[model samples]
Target chain A: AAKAYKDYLASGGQPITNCVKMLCTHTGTGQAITVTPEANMDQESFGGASCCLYCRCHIDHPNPKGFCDLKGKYVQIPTTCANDPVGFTLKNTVCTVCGMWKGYGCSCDQ
Target chain B: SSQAWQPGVAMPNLYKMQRMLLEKCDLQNYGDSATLPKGIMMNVAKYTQLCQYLNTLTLAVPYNMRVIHFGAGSDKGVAPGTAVLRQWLPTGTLLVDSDLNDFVSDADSTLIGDCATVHTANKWDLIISDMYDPKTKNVTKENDSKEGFFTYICGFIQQKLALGGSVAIKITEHSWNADLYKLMGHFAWWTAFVTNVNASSSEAFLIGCNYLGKPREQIDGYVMHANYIFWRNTNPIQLSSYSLFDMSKFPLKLRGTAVMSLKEGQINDMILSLLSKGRLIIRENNRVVISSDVLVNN
Candidate 1:
């Protein structure tokens, strides 16, 4: 049963892409780069609070609580509930703009 | 002073449009002269120019080809057919303007005249015509009653053109003719070519043997040229419901067809054998010549 599920995953489970976090702003922007210790700074170029994280998609989060709620402010879901088990973390997401989307440093089409 | 028809005279600006052909866009061929695979550092109008360039080179300007020069006007000298006919026939090229008159010239063709003494063509190499029936006022204003010899000239080419010969005209409807496209329900030239009826008359009964006669199997091929749709050359043109003006794009129907499907022999008399006019639709062997092959070079 596990092998069959793995086969489905290999075929293509879902659309996934990697994301990277930068110092500048909400979506990777702005002239200056912030320091490592001061990561995920409060002030972003979007004038909103920043949640710095790399890898916009999810893989596996081994925590007992789930990872992404896909709603509210910053999206810090429970690592594990019966619904989802988060292992690999994704980049932070921002509001969509003109049929386009941005997650962390990556801007994607919605 | 007019430019003499010289050998390597650079083709006119209206002829060579490399700028429009390689508009720096969807490039198929972009080069200095659209050399086969033309590629270029194009601009924003690449799409329009690219389509323009590829179209101009449909056939590598048939250099050694005959022509039929017919028409009476001021542009009489530099007409594409007039300038190019000498490339094939150095002498003895007959210029028929109409049944009554012709443009007769000497050995070098330094001057053009209308004398029966000079012009003679028992078998002409090429036939170029711009003569529409002054009777019909060039087929647009007056049509259906008699398409006149203007359209029937295609039949002349079918019966007359030499071995590797063709007929080129400067008519208005080479690309699109209204008589073929009666309505939305009618088929295009492709469908009509397959059909056993002629569409020349814009009527059903007119598709009889007069226009669409017995097609001989020995015939070779038919080619039509235009400026816009052909990008100035010959390709399988997109025909549709239209008027003669639509086909030529010049709103004039002065050109004629060369590959008519009429019977080859005499009709009424030996001296004045009455040739049946156009309706080549009934039997598809015949085709109308709306414009000349000038676009192939330009």
Candidate 2:
């Protein structure tokens, strides 16, 4: 899996589309499950549903996905990610020099 | 004029000397592979000597220059060159380091990424790259060659360095070839010298001062080529084959100086005298003093 992901990145694959797996938290039950974005939209309308994205651990970035820290690479957001799902905390930090945000897995402290 | 060398007199200042040596030096005669005039290979006994020698050179940078130190490991709180520069640069000067490790507390900011990937918005006035990987036990390389790294770094330099900025970097001795010197033609003046700070050291320093911003197409082509080599993990293409920058068109302000040796003797005295008087005097094989006013002025 890691090798495949690394190969994908080397071949100029987009990390967000290829590697990111969103974990959506159920609004009512407060339970979370790993989700595949387009295919798993059945639970999108739950109240207070929050989501966190994780990199599949194959690529390297400034902040790798926390859950996939062992194998995941950090994700880079060239610009702001707007219209995040309702109740998503929007965990991102901007680089002072480049003014680009560290997407998904990074904390504000960075 | 008295030729006596004063022990403690301040060396000739950079501004006056800069004007006199504005004419480009003729480097074409050296051909592609021959040793450059005034290029001596000096193996200094101490690292400080190397640093001090570099500090003497006239680098073009503002007092509040933006500086970046690449490949500075976190384990060592500050890089040797960084420490030296900090003492001289003003408080307003900004210092940033890009490293995989996050232990650098001295720099104003730390960008956590490999030197090749980390992007910055602003062009820097000076760049110091001491990129050595301990795991590899040598200067950073890809596929057992430093060309890829050099190409990538040169691309970065061309993109990120402000006009007239400077670069001080450490590279492997084997990597210092005529092609590398040609690659360095983007700058007005550049020199590569080796130091024996470590008994088994294979490292050398290359310093380029006063950048000459090339055309956008040339920069883009070089950067694209570098990116292909870095990301695809492929061997570097011959730089000469590419329509990068034309070297013959841009005349260098000074010939690249390679210090062959710096032992305490006539050669050392000559170097000191040259630095002090703003002249470079090289003794040929027959012990004739061939002097140039470009490096040393009356």
Candidate 3:
């Protein structure tokens, strides 16, 4: 079964490109933070954060807990999620806590 | 003092362009002139075998062609046809003007002088013309019944084309009184050629022969001159859809058959026979040079 899954992964191909850390400023919780080295800075990800790493599309998080909205805001999801009709599949997700979803893609009904 | 038609007598702008091309543009491959091809270039403005004639003439003068555009008016500078045509030739110039202006001696060689006596030796291997009826006097005026400059051009071809050569003309419309048809017959003297037409266009091209009695499948090099004009000339040209007719299929309407049963010989005989009864004494195949009052009343 592992061999089959490995072959499938090989066929599925490489994930997104070089990981970029997006800056996140939180108006909530406290004051605005400088765009910086701290992880998950993208304010859209959580209500307050500094930054997060993403390679092309897949986030650095082991389990992606939410989908990125059009505004770069992250919408938390339940269980294994299905793609919105717009076109996307959740099966190719990286298992990490990444709010990254928009461009590298996830169409969320929420 | 009028200028004589001589080498090095081209328009100043054109002469300058040729110098730059040969010197700066490396128009010639080397000092050897044969590296370039040469022949006469002809550009028809409205409609002619320009497109097909290019394909046809290449069979002969394979290279080093020349040009002399016959129907353009005074220019701000030498026309592009002149520039492009002279590029491949060791030495040559062009005449681009409209039919309205006849040739003037001691004038630029580009001006088409009184063609009736122009090029008295009939030296051209190929001649092409694109002519149409003139515009009405007023913008609001419209008249379909008008003859074009091509009638005058037929007279030009009658005296200008070399033996076994070809001539193509695009008229305003196919008509019986067209001097090209009245003066020249299809496949009668030269091999009649075929051409493509913009199927959407109301106009068609009429290619004529300059030789006597049918085509021997002979061709010429003006196509080389024409190709350069179409490819290199930068004149304002509006392009459109077109189709080619096969040369093998001669114009059926002009073919000697029931389509035109009465021959020229029969018509002449009938005219002479009718006038003979009145004692006019006109012989067949002969004209009355002496038309006095007595001759007309008689």
Where does candidate 1 stray beyond 4 Å? A1-110, B1-66, B72-81, B87-121, B133-146, B173-298
lDDT of 2 by residue, B2-66 (tens): 11111001112232122121121122212232121121111112223344445556654343456
Q: Kindly give the stretch of ten consecutive residues in candidate 3 chain B with the minimal lDDT sum.
A: B1-10
Write candidate 1's Cα lDDT for A1-110 as tens digits.
23443454468663221111111212222111221111122222110011211112223333467442321112221212101111122322234342112433334443
Docking class of 2: incorrect
Ranking by TM-score: 2, 3, 1
Per-residue lDDT tens digits for candidate 3, residues A19-109, read 1111112222211221111212222211111112221123343347653321111222111221111112233332232333443323343
lDDT of 1 by residue, B1-298 (tens): 1111110111232422222211111111112121111111111011112112212211111222223455432222212222222212323333333223322211122223322223333333334444543333343442222334533554454444432232333333222233222211111111111001111111111011121122321211111111121232222222211111111111112123232223336322321111222211111222222221222453
Which of candidates 2 and 3 is the stronger one according to DockQ?
Answer: 2
Which numbered prediction scores highest in TM-score against the true structure? 2
The CA lDDT at A83 in model 1 is 19
- As for DockQ, the candidate ahead, 1 or 2, is 2
- Tens-digit lDDT track of model 3 for B101-216: 43211111344333443333223434545444344223344322234454566555554443333455543222213334434442223222222212212233444443222222
Top-lDDT candidate index: 2
